Design a binder for this molecule. Structure first.
Ligand SMILES: [Zn+2]
Length: 124
C-alpha cells in the first residue's frame, strides 16, 4: 500500500501573467492597456474596449438590457457588452469568446511599465 497524488482541483490561479490579444481571423494585435485590469479568479472580463472603426456591435431584442459585439472586418460576432444595466457599478463590462480572439503572452513577465526613447527632427 502506497499510492501518490497531489492536485488543487483546477489550474486557474496562475492565469494573470502579462500579454496581448490578437484577432481569431486577422491575427493583428489589438487591445488597449486601459480596458482591462489584473486579477486571478473565475469570470474573466474587461471593463472597457479600444472602440476602433474595424469592429462593430448591435443591441439585443430578446435581451434588451445587453448587446452583442462583432469583428465586423472579418465578419465574426461572439463577444458582448451588458450595456445600460449597470452604470454606477462595475456592472456593464464586456465579455468575449476564446473563438473571437486569441491570447499571445509576454516572454516570461515584465510589461505594464513605462519607457520612452523617440526622435526625428530636421531643418534645411
Ligand atoms: Zn478580425
Amino acid at each position: 500500500m502506497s499510492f501518490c497524488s497531489f492536485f488543487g482541483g483546477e489550474v486557474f490561479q496562475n492565469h494573470f501573467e502579462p500579454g496581448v490579444y490578437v484577432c481569431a481571423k486577422c491575427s493583428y494585435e489589438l487591445f488597449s492597456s486601459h480596458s482591462k485590469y489584473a486579477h486571478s479568479s473565475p469570470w474573466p472580463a474587461f471593463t472597457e474596449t479600444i472602440h476602433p472603426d474595424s469592429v462593430t456591435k448591435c443591441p439585443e431584442k430578446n435581451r434588451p438590457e445587453a448587446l452583442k459585439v462583432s469583428c465586423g472586418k472579418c465578419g465574426n460576432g461572439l463577444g458582448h457588452e451588458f450595456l445600460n444595466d449597470g452604470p454606477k457599478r462595475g456592472q456593464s463590462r464586456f465579455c468575449i469568446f476564446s473563438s473571437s480572439l486569441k491570447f499571445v503572452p509576454k516572454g516570461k513577465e515584465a510589461a505594464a511599465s513605462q519607457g520612452h526613447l523617440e526622435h526625428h527632427h530636421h531643418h534645411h
